[PDB]
């Protein structure tokens, strides 16, 4: 029986845009959403998945998922999508990573006031301890 | 040892298009494909993943994955992709959700006679009990 | 506690382009990267995920993930993405498959000298025994 956390947006805060996250599914207690980041309390291997739904015209959009721990900062994975010059695209990515207690997980979109959907069905972030 | 179900198309039936599903991998017995829906017999937390391969010209395409249970209907997640005006795009999404026995899982594409691939390598639906 | 393998590029080798893979996370011992393929030593059910980050102009890009075992060759899944005529797109796909010891897993891009990113955050391949 695995520990899990599935998070959806509460609001979008504006080089960078981030998402304030709220839990809608939680089992176990080794992970905690604290506003726009997720704290890791339990060292382990986790499946981490991220989707962002973008509405921006023209430019390449994508999210970057990173870990910052005892002294260093590391990108884990990124999703990238070209947008039509006209409108709509979800960007999903996921992978398996060793996370260390004390780690902070960030999901950042490297554009100002990025037009991201608040919809829980389109933009979400989650974890499964493996 | 986890219960799992991986499903692929048998045919595509035409506001809405759906897929008739057939199992190609099954372990355990808490899930059942019944034509264009999947019944959940066992309450639990599941990773649910969905890919659809689209061939439509011009318009935004995407699939919507939902649960209908004791009295209510809920979208779980959606995938969205703009299509070139020219041709080809897979749309993958997945997440972790608490499903209740008696639940019906639907995968719907909100366009008439949507040009979806029957290929099992391009359009598929699956579950892993966590 | 699941066996896992997360692999990233070392270099890209040129009808076909493949990736030479190196492990960055490994638990258990039922899987082995050997250059551009992955050998399966342990029969089981695995979540297999693949992302490729493409930089090619114009044409439809995508990767194909296959298994070759005792006498037969089988596509497992593929990801497909149209590219702008202008630039950038990640293609992620994943699914659950029964793999047999002795199996060889391949990730192929069906274009010559495909412009793929070596970045470990953009192009990766992984496995979780279920």
């Amino acid at each position: 029986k695995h520990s899990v956390l599935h998070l959806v947006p509460v609001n979008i805060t504006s080089d960078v845009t981030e998402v304030m996250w709220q839990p809608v599914l939680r089992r176990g207690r080794g992970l905690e959403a604290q506003g726009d980041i997720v704290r890791v309390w339990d060292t382990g291997i986790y499946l981490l998945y991220s989707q962002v739904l973008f509405h921006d015209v023209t430019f390449t959009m994508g999210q970057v998922v990173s870990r910052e721990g005892q002294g260093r900062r590391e990108t884990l994975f990124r999703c990238i999508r070209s947008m039509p010059s006209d409108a709509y695209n979800s960007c999903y990515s996921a992978g398996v990573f060793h996370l260390h207690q004390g780690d902070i997980i960030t999901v950042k979109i490297p554009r100002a006031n990025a037009k991201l959907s608040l919809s829980p069905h389109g933009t979400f972030l989650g974890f499964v301890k493996l």
Side-chain angles (χ1 to χ4, degrees), chain A residues 2-13 16-54 56-58 60-69 71 73-85 87-110 112-130:
Chain A
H2 294 230
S3 301
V4 314
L5 184 64
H6 186 83
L7 305 158
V8 300
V10 311
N11 74 301
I12 289 145
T13 62
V16 169
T17 296
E18 286 168 279
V19 180
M20 299 288 270
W21 298 103
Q22 55 179 332
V24 297
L25 179 59
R26 187 174 54 266
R27 180 162 66 196
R29 55 211 160 255
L31 295 166
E32 192 186 2
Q34 303 193 329
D36 68 8
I37 58 141
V38 184
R39 297 234 47 189
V40 176
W41 305 125
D42 185 3
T43 294
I45 293 175
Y46 293 85
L47 177 64
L48 195 29
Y49 59 86
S50 166
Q51 186 169 287
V52 179
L53 170 51
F54 297 97
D56 280 321
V57 69
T58 278
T60 299
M61 297 307 298
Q63 74 267 28
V64 189
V65 180
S66 311
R67 77 146 146 108
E68 351 181 1
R73 143 163 171 195
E74 185 184 307
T75 302
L76 300 184
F77 60 94
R78 97 196 316 124
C79 190
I80 310 158
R81 287 256 167 300
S82 300
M83 298 300 307
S85 52
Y88 303 87
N89 278 307
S90 55
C91 209
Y92 180 95
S93 185
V96 179
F97 303 95
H98 182 75
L99 305 184
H100 304 235
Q101 61 174 340
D103 278 0
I104 297 168
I105 310 304
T106 51
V107 181
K108 297 180 160 181
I109 294 78
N113 291 309
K115 298 231 164 192
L116 312 180
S117 171
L118 282 183
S119 167
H121 318 105
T123 297
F124 54 80
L125 177 65
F127 300 74
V128 180
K129 192 174 150 89
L130 298 179

